[PDB]
Amino acid sequence: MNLTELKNTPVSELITLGENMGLENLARMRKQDIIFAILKQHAKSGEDIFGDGVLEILQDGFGFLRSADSSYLAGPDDIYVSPSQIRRFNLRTGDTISGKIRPPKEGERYFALLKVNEVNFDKPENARNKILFENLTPLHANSRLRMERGNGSTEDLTARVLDLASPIGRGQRGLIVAPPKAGKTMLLQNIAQSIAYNHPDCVLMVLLIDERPEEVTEMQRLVKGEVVASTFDEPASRHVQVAEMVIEKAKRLVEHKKDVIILLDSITRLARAYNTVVPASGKVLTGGVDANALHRPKRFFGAARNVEEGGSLTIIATALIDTGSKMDEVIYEEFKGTGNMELHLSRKIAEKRVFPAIDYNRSGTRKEELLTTQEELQKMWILRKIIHPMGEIDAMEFLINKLAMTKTNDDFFEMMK
Amino acid sequence: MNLTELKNTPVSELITLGENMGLENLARMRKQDIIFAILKQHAKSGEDIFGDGVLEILQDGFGFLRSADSSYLAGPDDIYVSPSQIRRFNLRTGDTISGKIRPPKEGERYFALLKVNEVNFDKPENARNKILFENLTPLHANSRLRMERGNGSTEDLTARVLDLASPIGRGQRGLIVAPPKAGKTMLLQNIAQSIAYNHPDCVLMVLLIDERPEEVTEMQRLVKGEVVASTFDEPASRHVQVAEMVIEKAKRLVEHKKDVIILLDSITRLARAYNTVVPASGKVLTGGVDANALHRPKRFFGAARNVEEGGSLTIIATALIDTGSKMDEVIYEEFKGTGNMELHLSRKIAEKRVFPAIDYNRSGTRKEELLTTQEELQKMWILRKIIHPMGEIDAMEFLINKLAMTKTNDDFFEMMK
RNA sequence: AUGUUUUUU
Numbered sequence: 001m002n003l004t005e006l007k008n009t010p011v012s013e014l015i016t017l018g019e020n021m022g023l024e025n026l027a028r029m030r031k032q033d034i035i036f037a038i039l040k041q042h043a044k045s046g047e048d049i050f051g052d053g054v055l056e057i058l059q060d061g062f063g064f065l066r067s068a069d070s071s072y073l074a075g076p077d078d079i080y081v082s083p084s085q086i087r088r089f090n091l092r093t094g095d096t097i098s099g100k101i102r103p104p105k106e107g108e109r110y111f112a113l114l115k116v117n118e119v120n121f122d123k124p125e126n127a128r129n130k131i132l133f134e135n136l137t138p139l140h141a142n143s144r145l146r147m148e149r150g151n152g153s154t155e156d157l158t159a160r161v162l163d164l165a166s167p168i169g170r171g172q173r174g175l176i177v178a179p180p181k182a183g184k185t186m187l188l189q190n191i192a193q194s195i196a197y198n199h200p201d202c203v204l205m206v207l208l209i210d211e212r213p214e215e216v217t218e219m220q221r222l223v224k225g226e227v228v229a230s231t232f233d234e235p236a237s238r239h240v241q242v243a244e245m246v247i248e249k250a251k252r253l254v255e256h257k258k259d260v261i262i263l264l265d266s267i268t269r270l271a272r273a274y275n276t277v278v279p280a281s282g283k284v285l286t287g288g289v290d291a292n293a294l295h296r297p298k299r300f301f302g303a304a305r306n307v308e309e310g311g312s313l314t315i316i317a318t319a320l321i322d323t324g325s326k327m328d329e330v331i332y333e334e335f336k337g338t339g340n341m342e343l344h345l346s347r348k349i350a351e352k353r354v355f356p357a358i359d360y361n362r363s364g365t366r367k368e369e370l371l372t373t374q375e376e377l378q379k380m381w382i383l384r385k386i387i388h389p390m391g392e393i394d395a396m397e398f399l400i401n402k403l404a405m406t407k408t409n410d411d412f413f414e415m416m417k
Numbered sequence: 418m419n420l421t422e423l424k425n426t427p428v429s430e431l432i433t434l435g436e437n438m439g440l441e442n443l444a445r446m447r448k449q450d451i452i453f454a455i456l457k458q459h460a461k462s463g464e465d466i467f468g469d470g471v472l473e474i475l476q477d478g479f480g481f482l483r484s485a486d487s488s489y490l491a492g493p494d495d496i497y498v499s500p501s502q503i504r505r506f507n508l509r510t511g512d513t514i515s516g517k518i519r520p521p522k523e524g525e526r527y528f529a530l531l532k533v534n535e536v537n538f539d540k541p542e543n544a545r546n547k548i549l550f551e552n553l554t555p556l557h558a559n560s561r562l563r564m565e566r567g568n569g570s571t572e573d574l575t576a577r578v579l580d581l582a583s584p585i586g587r588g589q590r591g592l593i594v595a596p597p598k599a600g601k602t603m604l605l606q607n608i609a610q611s612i613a614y615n616h617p618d619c620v621l622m623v624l625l626i627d628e629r630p631e632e633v634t635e636m637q638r639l640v641k642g643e644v645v646a647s648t649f650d651e652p653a654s655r656h657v658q659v660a661e662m663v664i665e666k667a668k669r670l671v672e673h674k675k676d677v678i679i680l681l682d683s684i685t686r687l688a689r690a691y692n693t694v695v696p697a698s699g700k701v702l703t704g705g706v707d708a709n710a711l712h713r714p715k716r717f718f719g720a721a722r723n724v725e726e727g728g729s730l731t732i733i734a735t736a737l738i739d740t741g742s743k744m745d746e747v748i749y750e751e752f753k754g755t756g757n758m759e760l761h762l763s764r765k766i767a768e769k770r771v772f773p774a775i776d777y778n779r780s781g782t783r784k785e786e787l788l789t790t791q792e793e794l795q796k797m798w799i800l801r802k803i804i805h806p807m808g809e810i811d812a813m814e815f816l817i818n819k820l821a822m823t824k825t826n827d828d829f830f831e832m833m834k
Numbered sequence: 835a836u837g838u839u840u841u842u843u
C-alpha cells in the first residue's frame with residue numbers, strides 16, 4: 001500500500017477496484033478522491049498504509065509531504081507531519097520521509113505520520129549525524145562531465161561544439177546567454193539527453209518556471225529524469241515556493257554525497273517573480289528592479305558548489321537578453337559577474353538557419369586546465385587562435401564542415417596539425 | 418419565439434407587429450423596448466419564450482446571458498441566471514445556455530431561466546462530465562492550416578508570401594510585429610478571408626479593442642465570422658470584460674474539442690488597458706509599466722495551446738512598435754520572448770508602396786518541420802539562403818516578380834532548381 | 835514625487 005503506486009495506476013483500474021470494494025459510484029469522482037476512498041476502505045480492515053514525499057515545513061511549525069508528480073503543489077493527499085516528530089528527528093525542509101500513514105479521523109483533513117522508516121533514502125541513524133550544507137568546503141570543478149555522445153550521431157555535433165567551447169564539470173555554475181528565438185529549447189533538450197546518456201548516475205532535475213505548458217509536457221516526455229515545472233498560469237508565489245523546494249531538496253541530496261544537476265531555464269523569470277513578490281520599499285532602481293529583489297536569486301544561483309567531502313551541485317541557468325525590457329537587461333549582467341561560464345548564442349547565426357548558433361568567440365570556461373589534459377588544452381588553444389580571426393558565421397560554418405568529416409574531435413585535432 | 422430571431426428582424430416589421438398586437442405607440446420607442454413589449458404580450462397569452470447567450474457569472478454568485486451582437490455589453494434584455502441553477506449544473510463563465518425564459522414579474526428587471534435545454538451546443542449529459550482546460554496536455558502545432566487560396570487571384574500573393582515565410586498550424590501562438598502605417602489592416606483582412614475560405618469549419622473570432630468605429634463596422638461587414646470589438650469611446654473596464662468573456666468562451670469551446678481561432682489586433686492596447694485598471698502599488702518600472710500589469714495579458718496570450726485530446730486554440734496578436742511611447746516598447750516587447758512566431762513588417766518597404774511589406778529575413782517559425790514535408794522544408798531553406806544576402810526591398814521585389822509569373826509556389830520552387 | 839521611466843555612447 002504505497003501512495004505513488006496508486007498514483008501511477010490508471011483511472012479505469014482504480015474505478016474497477018473501488019467498485020469491487022463496494023463504495024459510492026467512482027465514475028463521477030476524481031482520481032485523488034478515488035484513491036482516498038480506497039485507502040480509507042483498506043485501513044478500515046486493519047491493514048497499514050505507507051506513503052512518501054518531500055517535507056515542506058511551514059512557518060507555524062508543522063509541515064506536509066509534497067509529491068513530485070504535481071510539481072510540489074498543495075494537494076488534499078498531503079501527509080501531515082506534527083512538529084513533535086520534527087523536533088524529535090531534527091527534520092528540515094527537503095528531507096525525504098517514507099513511513100506508515102493513517103487516514104484522517106473525524107475532524108482531520110490530512111494523513112498523519114506514525115513511524116518514519118527511511119530518511120533521505122537512507123537509515124535515520126545516518127541522517128541524525130550529518131554536516132550541514134553551509135559548512136561544506138567549496139572547491140572548483142575537478143571531475144570532468146563529458147557531454148560527447150560518441151555514437152557518431154548527427155545530433156552529437158552540438159555536444160561536440162559545446163565540449164570544444166566550454167567543458168562542464170561537477171559543481172559548475174554557468175550561464176546560457178541567448179536572445180529569444182535562438183534555439184534554447186533544442187539546446188537544453190540536447191544537453192539533458194547527453195547528461196542522461198553519458199552520466200545516468202547523476203540526479204537530473206529540470207526546472208521550468210513561467211513557461212508554455214505544451215513545452216512542459218514536451219520536456220516531461222522527452223528527458224530521462226525528473227521534471228518540476230510551473231506554467232505562467234500560476235502566480236509568482238508558487239514559482240518562489242517551487243524554487244525553494246527544489247533548492248532545499250538539492251541541498252539535502254548533496255548533504256548525502258549525491259551529484260545533483262539542475263538545468264534552470266528561467267533565471268530571468270525567477271528574478272521577475274522575486275521582484276514581484278517582494279514588498280515595495282519606496283525605492284526603485286533603473287529598469288524597475290528593487291534593491292532587495294535580486295538577493296534571493298543571487299543566493300539560489302550561488303548555492304551551486306563542488307563539495308570536497310563528497311557530491312556536487314551543478315546549476316546551468318539560461319538568461320534572457322534583448323527582450324525589449326530594461327529590467328531583464330539589468331538582471332542578466334548583474335548576474336554576468338556571476339556564472340563561472342558563459343555560453344553566448346548569436347541571433348544573426350540563428351537567422352541563417354545554422355544550428356547550433358553558438359558564439360564560440362565569447363564562450364569559454366575559467367580554470368579549464370582542471371578538466372582537460374595538457375595536449376587537449378593546447379589543441380583547444382590552437383583551435384581558438386585559428387577561429388578568432390574569422391567571423392562568427394564563417395567560423396561556425398568552418399567548424400561544422402570540419403566536424404562533419406569525422407566522428408570524434410580527436411581526429412579533427414590530429415588533422416589540424 | 419427566440420431572442421436572436423427578433424433581434425435580426427428590422428425595425429419596421431417589429432413596429433408593425435407591435436401595432437397589430439395592440440400596445441402603446443412603438444414608433445417613438447427603442448427596438449429593444451419594442452421586443453420586450455412584444456415578448457410580454459406574447460407571454461400574457463400563455464406561450465413560451467426561448468433565449469440564448471453566453472453566461473457571465475458575477476462576483477456575488479448570479480449571472481447574465483450576454484449577446485454577441487452587442488459585443489457582450491450590459492443590456493436590459495439580459496437573462497438572469499440564479500446561483501441555484503449554477504450550483505445545480507456546475508455552470509461557469511463562457512457556457513452557452515439556451516432554454517426557456519419568462520418576462521420579469523412585478524419587482525424584477527430581467528428575464529428568468531426556468532429550464533435549460535442545450536449547453537454549449539450539446540446535451541447537458543455530455544457537458545456535466547468534461548475535462549477542464551487547465552488539465553489538457555499541450556502540444557506543438559501538428560495540423561497544417563494552409564493559407565494559400567489556390568484560385569490564382571492577385572490578392573493571393575500575400576497568402577503565398579505568408580506561407581513561404583511562416584506557415585501557421587493549429588494551436589499556434591504568434592505575433593505580428595509592425596510599426597504604425599504599415600498595412601496591418603489589409604494584412605489582417607487577407608488573413609481572415611483566407612481562413613474563412615480555406616478552413617470554414619474553424620470558429621473564427623476577431624477581437625478589436627480600442628479601435629475606430631469605422632474600422633469596426635468595416636471588419637464586421639467584410640469577414641465571414643464573428644466580430645467582437647470595443648471602440649476607444651469605452652473605458653478600459655469594458656475592454657478587460659470583453660477580453661475575459663472572449664477567452665472564457667474560447668476555453669469552453671476548446672473543452673468540447675473545437676478549433677478556435679482568435680485574431681487579436683490590440684495586444685498593446687489590451688496591455689495598456691490592464692495597466693490602467695490595475696490599482697497603483699507605488700512602484701513604477703521603466704516606461705510607466707506596473708509590475709503586476711503584464712500578468713493578465715501574459716496569461717491571455719499563453720492561453721493559446723494545442724490539445725492532444727481534441728481541438729486547438731490559435732491566437733495571432735499584432736504588436737505595436739515605434740509608436741513614440743516607451744511603454745509600448747516595453748509592453749509590445751517583454752512579449753517578444755514569449756511567443757513562437759514573429760512576422761515583422763518593414764516601414765521602409767511600406768513607404769515605397771510595395772505591398773505586402775513583409776520582413777522576410779526576421780520572419781520564421783520554430784519547429785516548422787512538423788507542418789511541412791521534407792522537400793518543402795528543403796526548398797524553403799534554399800529560398801531563405803538565396804534571399805538572405807539580398808537587401809530587404811530587393812528581396813521583396815525579387816519575390817514579387819517571381820511569384821507573379823506563376824500561380825502556385827510549387828512551380829516557382831521547381832523553376833528555382 | 836527621489837530611484838525606475840525619460841536615457842544614449
Ligand SMILES: Nc1ncnc2c1ncn2[C@@H]1O[C@H](COP(=O)(O)OP(=O)(O)O)[C@@H](O)[C@H]1O
Nearest residue numbers: 179180181182183184185186187355356783784
Ligand atoms: N539545434 C537545432 N537544430 C535545429 N533547429 C534549432 C536548433 N536549436 C533551435 N532551433 C530552432 O529554433 C527554434 C527556437 O529555439 P529555442 O531553443 O526555443 O530558442 P530559445 O529557447 O532561445 O527561445 C526552434 O523551434 C528550432 O526550430
Ligand SMILES: Nc1ncnc2c1ncn2[C@@H]1O[C@H](COP(=O)(O)OP(=O)(O)O)[C@@H](O)[C@H]1O
Nearest residue numbers: 575595596597598599600601602603604772773
Ligand atoms: N496589401 C496591401 N496592399 C495595398 N495597400 C496596403 C496593403 N497593406 C497596407 N496597405 C496600405 O497601408 C495603409 C495602412 O495599412 P494598415 O494595415 O492600416 O497598417 P497598420 O495596421 O500597421 O496601421 C492602408 O490604408 C493601405 O492603403
Ligand code: BEF
Nearest residue numbers: 179180181184754
Ligand atoms: F523564446 Be526563447 F525560449 F528565449
Ligand code: BEF
Nearest residue numbers: 596597598599601
Ligand atoms: F496604425 Be496601425 F493600425 F498600427
Ligand SMILES: [Mg+2]
Nearest residue numbers: 183184185265
Ligand atoms: Mg526557450
Ligand SMILES: [Mg+2]
Nearest residue numbers: 600601602682
Ligand atoms: Mg491597424
